[PDB]
Amino acid sequence: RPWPEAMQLITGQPNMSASAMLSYFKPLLDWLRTENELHGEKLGWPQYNWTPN
Amino acid sequence: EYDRTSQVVWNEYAEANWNYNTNITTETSKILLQKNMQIANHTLKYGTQARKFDVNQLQNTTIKRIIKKVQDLERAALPAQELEEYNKILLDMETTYSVATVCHPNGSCLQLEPDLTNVMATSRKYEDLLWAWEGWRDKAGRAILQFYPKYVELINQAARLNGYVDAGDSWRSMYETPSLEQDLERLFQELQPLYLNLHAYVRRALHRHYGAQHINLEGPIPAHLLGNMWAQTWSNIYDLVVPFPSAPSMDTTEAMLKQGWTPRRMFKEADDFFTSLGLLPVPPEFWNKSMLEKPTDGREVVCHASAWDFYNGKDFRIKQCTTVNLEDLVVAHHEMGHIQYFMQYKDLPVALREGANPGFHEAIGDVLALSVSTPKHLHSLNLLSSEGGSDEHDINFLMKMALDKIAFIPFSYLVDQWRWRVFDGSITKENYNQEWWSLRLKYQGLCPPVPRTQGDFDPGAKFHIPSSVPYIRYFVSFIIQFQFHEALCQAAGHTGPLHKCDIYQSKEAGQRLATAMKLGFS
Amino acid sequence: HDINFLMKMALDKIAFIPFSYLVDQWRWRVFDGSITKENYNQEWWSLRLKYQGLCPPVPRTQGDF
Ligand SMILES: *[C@@H]1O[C@H](CO)[C@@H](O)[C@H](O)[C@H]1NC(C)=O
Ligand SMILES: *[C@@H]1O[C@H](CO)[C@@H](O)[C@H](O)[C@H]1NC(C)=O
């Protein structure tokens, strides 16, 4: 049988979602955001044209 | 009824555009905004009326075409607040690009069109070129980046309401080609080897001049060591890449100085060539009603534009002012072609008064310009060149003409490729510049002279990016104009060395151009 | 203890997510003919920079694969 049927059988929805992954790492995500805002750091790499050597 | 009302509405809108582009103030901005609101109102009303019609069941072609073209509202499909915000964003981007001047804080300041372009095309010092390039990119891009995401979102919303898909389909639908991208990619792959050879030769010449610290044999050339602020048409100044300097090589620098060669008489010469081709002349009011010279005050015009049509059948002005040069002559020929194309289909209805293909305008304007740039026609008019007497002269002219019209193909492809990618959401706001420079490296052979970090909106330095006009029409026109010239030279009765074939009193070629150019968008 | 364990698991899995998304993306683009042959490493490193945020420690010229 096609994949969505087994997806619905295992969980209940015939779709792929990242909500479970985000919920699993929620305490870590919150603590990491707090630490990053405390340390004064910006997300991403806004100096993309950079090479160590 | 639509034609009857649209004629006057668009005539008044074009008058407002003239007044804004010549008498730049804040009252001109207010008048332009409110007249944009008025034309949006008219277009919305008549498009809503035409939406009740059905195009599929209409058993005709011309009326079907008119209804189909009027079906979409373009920008006027947005809500009132969204339309007002979009107009304000577009005006703000245009006015922050036109007025931007970058300078050393010592006190002396320079403008793009008068001085920065001149100081970039003339100077040969690495540091001065780097200063000009970096400063202009800095100021223009950092000014425009604040607005650009909002403009992208609003234009995407307008296109989605019009029934297209994320504003890429909207601009690709002007060509009526479901397979446009594949055809253009095939054409670019065909032109790739010649461009690669020219790039290698130019890199060798630049390494000979600037040394090895800046330019190495293996690798890209810096994007500012070429001649233009954007390197769109690089090394048009070919004094550094001339194959072998020969005595009969044309100078084309003093040949328009000891004879005066005012812009008025250059446009007169272009019009005379157009008439001798066998085409109807421009109305006499054009010269004394338009403007093509420097002003008598500080505020003259926007940085760069093209010819303007008023759709009322009498006003065919030209706005370009660039003093006197050979590039000025070719640009004047291009604008004369634009005007003659605008004037050929005066008989057609207003909805069809656009042109057969957005690239056809530039292609037909520039094919005669390509024809007149040959040394034979220059010999026939005020100059003395060896023509086809020496093969070395022919190869030098070919190289000079190929530094134009080639190395512009990759840029004209690249700009609209990047804009299509950003419009369709593939380029996220966080990496506007990284993908632009990746395209610059991939298609062209250019590298950023200075590390260009995120937060520098390099694509905003091009005028067409904030002004929001398509750019791939130039690539299409540069592809097509050579086909047009080949056909017109075939109609001349001889082909031989096509690189030096010249069109002059070819009545049959002019007639063939007219019978297929009078069709317009029909 | 909870934060340490979650950080270890994140380093195990979420650090792997973008690389696994990028490698097959590059391969798909190669098979489609959108990568040609002149720039194999260039597009790979562009994808690495865009997704995983990594940079070549040494200048990677063409011919390295
Ligand atoms: C241009 O603007 C000035 C602003 O003082 C105005 O007086 C003038 O009438 C305008 N030009 C024309 C031709 O109306
Ligand atoms: C545009 O039409 C609407 C119709 O409701 C009207 O309210 C508005 O005043 C019109 N605007 C202009 C500038 O004519």
In SS3 terms, B438-477 reads as HHHHHCCCEECCCCCCCCCCHHHHCCHHHHCCCCHHHHHH
* Residue C4, min C-alpha distance to chain B (Å): 31
Chain B nearest-CA residue for A50: B451
Distance, in Å, from the CA atom of C46 to the CA atom of C35, rounded to the nearest integer, reads 12
Distance, in Å, from the CA atom of B479 to the CA atom of B482, rounded to the nearest integer, reads 6
CA distances from B74 to B84, B500, C40 (A): 14, 44, 41
Q: Which 3 state secondary structure label does DSSP give B479?
A: helix
Distance, in Å, from the CA atom of B487 to the CA atom of B474, rounded to the nearest integer, reads 20
B365, B376 Cβ separation under 8 angstroms = no
Any known ligand binding at C48?
A: yes
Q: Cα of B23 to ligand 1 centre, how many Å? A: 7
Burial (CB count within 10 angstroms: exposed 0-12, middle 13-18, buried 19+), residue B407: buried
CB contact under 8 A, A49 and B453: yes
Q: Is the CB of B37 under 6 A from ligand 2?
A: yes
Indicate the residue of B431, B441, B442 with minimum beta-carbon distance to C50: B431
Distance, in Å, from the CA atom of B499 to the CA atom of B486, rounded to the nearest integer, reads 10
Burial (CB count within 10 angstroms: exposed 0-12, middle 13-18, buried 19+), residue B74: middle
CB contact under 8 A, B451 and A44: no
Distance, in Å, from the CA atom of B512 to the CA atom of B108, rounded to the nearest integer, reads 54
Other beta carbons less than 10 A from residue B102's beta carbon: 18
Distance, in Å, from the CA atom of B46 to the CA atom of B283, rounded to the nearest integer, reads 32
Q: Dihedral sign for Cα B17, B21, B27, B33, please.
A: positive
| Amino acid at the residue B346 | K
Q: Which 3 state secondary structure label does DSSP give B230?
A: coil
Can you read off the two tokens belonging to residue B307?
A: 């010819």
- Please, which residues bridge with residue B446 across strands? B221
In the residue annotation, B127 being an active-site residue is answered as no
B497, B37 Cβ separation under 8 angstroms = no
Q: Which 3 state secondary structure label does DSSP give B222?
A: strand
| Amino acid at the residue C40 | Y
Burial (CB count within 10 angstroms: exposed 0-12, middle 13-18, buried 19+), residue B434: buried
Angle between helices B326-344 and B358-372 (to 10 degrees): 130
Distance, in Å, from the CA atom of B351 to the CA atom of B355, rounded to the nearest integer, reads 10
Please tell me what resolution, in angstroms, this structure has.
3.2
| Ligand 2 atom 1 nearest Cα | B41
CB contact under 8 A, B441 and C49: no
B318, B335 Cβ separation under 8 angstroms = yes
E strands, B98-150, where?
none
Residue tagged 């298609």 (tokens): B443
Distance, in Å, from the CA atom of C61 to the CA atom of C65, rounded to the nearest integer, reads 9
B292, B320 Cβ separation under 8 angstroms = yes
The ligand that comes nearest to the alpha carbon of residue B44 is: 2
Chain B residues within an 8 Å CB radius of A47: 451, 453-454
Other beta carbons less than 10 A from residue B23's beta carbon: 14
CA distances from B492 to B192, B271, B297, B360, C32 (A): 30, 21, 48, 21, 45
Please list, in sequence order, all residues whose beta carbon lies within 8 angstroms of the beta carbon of residue B33, skipping any fewer than 6 positions away.
B87, B88, B91
Distance, in Å, from the CA atom of C32 to the CA atom of B354, rounded to the nearest integer, reads 37
Ligand 2 pocket test target in B41, B44, B73, B83 with most atoms within 8 Å of CB: B41
CA distances from B179 to B175, B184, B470, B505 (A): 10, 9, 18, 38
CA distances from B204 to B197, B215, B256, B327 (A): 11, 9, 32, 25
Distance, in Å, from the CA atom of B231 to the CA atom of B444, rounded to the nearest integer, reads 10
| Ligand 2 atom 10 nearest Cα | B41
C49, B434 Cβ separation under 8 angstroms = yes
Ligand 2 atom closest to Cα of residue B38? 13
Distance, in Å, from the CA atom of A9 to the CA atom of A3, rounded to the nearest integer, reads 10
Please choose, from the candidates B234, B141, B148, the residue with its C-alpha nearest in 3D space to the C-alpha of residue B462: B141
Can you read off the two tokens belonging to residue B276?
A: 């001798």
Ligand 2 atom closest to Cα of residue B37? 13
| Amino acid at the residue B146 | Q
* Residue A36, min C-alpha distance to chain B (Å): 19
Distance, in Å, from the CA atom of A8 to the CA atom of B81, rounded to the nearest integer, reads 44
CA distances from B496 to B392, B480, B508 (A): 17, 20, 19
Contacting A residues, span 11-50, partner chain C, CB-CB under 8 Å: 21, 25, 27-28, 31, 44-45, 48, 50
B257, B486 Cβ separation under 8 angstroms = no
DSSP B221: E
Residue tagged 């901005």 (tokens): B29
CA atoms within 13 A on the CB side of B467: 14
Interface test with A, best of C6, C51, C60 (most A CBs within 10 A): C6
Interface test with B, best of A42, A47, A48, A53 (most B CBs within 10 A): A48
| Amino acid at the residue B289 | K
Indicate the residue of C3, C49, C58 with minimum beta-carbon distance to A48: C49
E strands, B350-424, where?
none
Chain B residues within an 8 Å CB radius of C42: 441-442
Please tell me the experimental approach by which this structure was elucidated: cryo-EM
Distance, in Å, from the CA atom of B255 to the CA atom of B259, rounded to the nearest integer, reads 7
In the residue annotation, B209 being an active-site residue is answered as no
Please choose, from the candidates B277, B409, B407, the residue with its C-alpha nearest in 3D space to the C-alpha of residue B336: B277
| Ligand 2 atom 14 nearest Cα | B38
Can you read off the two tokens belonging to residue C34?
A: 């959108």
Please list, in sequence order, all residues whose beta carbon lies within 8 angstroms of the beta carbon of residue B152, skipping any fewer than 6 positions away.
B167, B422, B423
